[PDB]
Paper text:
Our structural studies yielded the structure of M. catarrhalis FbpA in two different forms: an apo open form and an iron-holo open form. The tyrosine residues (Tyr141, Tyr197 and Tyr198) are positioned in the same orientation as in other known structures, which classifies McFbpA as a class III iron-binding protein. The Fe–OH distances of Tyr141, Tyr197 and Tyr198 are 2.1 Å, 1.9 Å, and 2.1 Å, respectively. Analysis of electron density typical for metal ions, as illustrated in Fig. 4c, localizes the iron atom in the appropriate position. In one of the four FbpA molecules in the holo crystal structure, we determined that two additional ferric ions are occupying the density surrounding the ferric ion bound by the three tyrosines. This might be caused by insufficient washing of the iron-bound protein, allowing for a slight excess amount of unbound ferric ion to remain with the protein.
Like MhFbpA and Thermus thermophilus FbpA (TtFbpA), McFbpA adopts a typical fold of class III periplasmic iron binding protein with the two globular lobes. Similar to other FbpA structures, McFbpA has two globular α/β domains named the N terminal lobe (Asn1-Trp95 and Val235-Val273) and the C terminal lobe (Tyr107-Ala221 and Thr274-Lys312). These two lobes are connected by a pair of antiparallel β strands (Phe96-Phe106 and Gly222-Val234), which acts as a hinge allowing for the adoption of either the open or closed conformation. Isogenic mutants of FbpA and AfeA were constructed, demonstrating that FbpA is essential for the utilization of human Tf and Lf as iron sources and that AfeA does not take up iron from these iron sources.
Author numbering: 1 to 312
């Protein structure tokens, strides 16, 4: 048989995934890749006549958007509920997180002692004036981070924090996380906020970046470090809902988690799968157990928050 996967991941990342599953089960896995928004806009337009069986997309913000658009169908999977922690999957069973990333603090260890660091909020402290760099607010990772900050600390507090962030900027917000991390390495930025897998990707290509850039896991005293996911769900109008579900259940297994998460320097979502050494080297940390669907529920508030704060 054959299944169709609409994927917002890097095309090279799913190619080994499709091959390993065809070798194990004989099922052909066709991958159609596009950006998350356009891909979901495609799935919504195709309706009942769609050829897609599985949607794989990035960030709980987008997974919540796809669920609100009605393009996913809830599935009852004992395998997925056991392999995937509850905070990393949709409460109404429409999607399941399969890799974990952290959005957290990075710093220049030649200029910043980790004892000076603690929380996202404390980055608004005036001691950071002229030392902070951020990636643009026009991005789902930052929308999702601020969405959880609103849920954890309230709207008024978060308004003050993000306004404090902007007042502390050493440079204009960067267009992507890798550019931010490189500007820390260049010495322009002393502290920043980014996704961990870009750091693993950057150290893989330029190992010397570690001299000027280290990771700090934020909010260890409170709720924990913000984590987010890439995840999958069965397309509502799939012609093969049973085989679509079997593929997603396989992705949560040990062997597939290594292929799915390790190659992109992300954490496995399955906690019985130990992270790849390059990732495990950064250390253990407490992660927030807020359900990551809150990243979507509070997305509009986060957008409004960053806009009122002058966070470009
Ligand atoms: Fe990314």
């Amino acid at each position: 048989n054959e299944i169709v996967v609409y994927s917002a991941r890097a095309d090279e990342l799913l190619k080994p995934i499709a091959e390993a599953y065809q070798q194990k089960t004989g099922t052909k896995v066709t991958v159609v890749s596009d950006k998350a928004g356009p891909l979901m806009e495609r799935l919504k337009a195709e309706g009942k006549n769609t050829q897609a069986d599985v949607l794989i997309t990035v960030d709980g913000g987008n997974l919540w958007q796809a669920t609100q658009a009605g393009v996913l169908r809830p599935i009852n999977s004992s395998v997925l509920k056991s392999n995937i922690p509850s905070h990393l999957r949709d409460p109404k069973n429409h999607w399941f997180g399969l890799s974990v990333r952290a959005r957290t603090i990075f710093y220049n260890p030649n200029k910043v002692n980790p004892s000076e660091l603690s929380t996202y909020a404390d980055l608004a402290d005036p001691k950071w004036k002229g030392r902070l760099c951020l990636r643009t607010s026009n991005n789902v990772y930052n929308q999702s981070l601020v969405a959880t900050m609103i849920a954890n600390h309230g709207q008024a507090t978060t308004d003050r924090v993000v306004k404090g962030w902007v007042a502390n900027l050493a440079a204009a917000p960067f267009a992507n996380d890798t550019a931010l991390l490189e500007a820390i390495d260049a010495g322009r930025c002393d502290v920043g906020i980014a996704n961990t897998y870009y750091y693993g990707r950057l150290l893989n290509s330029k190992p010397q970046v570690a001299n000027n850039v280290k990771v700090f896991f934020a909010n260890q005293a409170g709720k924990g470090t913000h984590v987010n996911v890439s995840g999958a769900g069965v397309v509502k109008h799939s012609d093969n809902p049973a085989e679509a579900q079997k593929f997603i259940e396989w992705l949560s297994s040990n062997e597939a988690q290594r292929l799915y998460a390790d190659r992109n320097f992300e954490y496995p979502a399955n906690i019985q799968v130990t992270p790849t050494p390059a990732v495990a080297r950064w250390g253990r940390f407490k992660q927030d157990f807020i359900n990551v669907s809150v990243a979507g529920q509070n997305q509009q508030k986060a957008i409004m928050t960053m806009k009122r704060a002058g966070y470009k």
